[PDB]
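lol forgot to send this yesterday, sorry. struct tokens for the thing we talked abt
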């Protein structure tokens, strides 16, 4: 198997999941890496936000971020949906998804247009503008993604391409929303 930014599935200056070969161009990394998270990284579904903070594991009282910087989508809850957009990101069905809309200047609150991983991701990321407040808000969108994903595709499978991704979606979304301790032998293709 090649490095390939699992997302893109293209080789390069990718970063292989020291745990599940999940390589990433970094930038394609859901929240986009910082610059190669070391050859010991582990996806975002496997590693998520850089915990390198070392300390402040539960002691900081309150500063820039510890347990609730906004609690919108919340640091970690945002991280979960990010465990998703990513989950999505990584697979193929999402590839179409990443880019479905005609965005231009309407997705932030567009009339339920088409969204896409990146759409949602930016939200999640705050890259966008209007960030959600729930990985279900998110999921709702990606779930939308999926909706129009399934209606726009028309070239791929139809549903089950969407769905298989829609399941994947909910899988990591399920992982993140628990402990991703379910099955570590299933995260390794
Ligand atoms: Zn890539
Ligand atoms: Zn991984």
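and heres what i got for the seq, position by position
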């Amino acid at each position: 198997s090649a490095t390939i930014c699992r997302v893109c599935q293209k080789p390069g200056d990718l970063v292989m999941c020291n745990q599940c070969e999940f390589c990433f161009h970094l930038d394609c990394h859901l929240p986009a890496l910082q610059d190669v998270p070391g050859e010991e990284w582990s996806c975002s579904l496997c590693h998520v936000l850089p915990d390198l903070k070392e300390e402040d594991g539960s002691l900081s009282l309150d500063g820039a971020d510890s347990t609730g910087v906004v609690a919108k989508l919340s640091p970690a809850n945002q991280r979960k949906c990010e465990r998703v957009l990513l989950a999505l990101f990584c697979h193929e069905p999402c590839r179409p998804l990443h880019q479905l809309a005609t965005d231009s200047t309407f997705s932030l609150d567009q009339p339920g247009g088409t969204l896409d991983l990146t759409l949602i991701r930016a939200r999640l990321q705050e890259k966008l503008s209007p960030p959600y407040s729930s990985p279900q808000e998110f999921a709702q969108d990606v779930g939308r993604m999926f909706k129009q994903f399934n209606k726009l595709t028309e070239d791929k499978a139809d549903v089950q391409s969407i769905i298989g991704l829609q399941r994947f979606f909910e899988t990591r979304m399920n992982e993140a929303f628990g402990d991703t301790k379910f099955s570590a032998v299933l995260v390794e293709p």
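The chain has five helices and no strands. anyway ping me if u want another try
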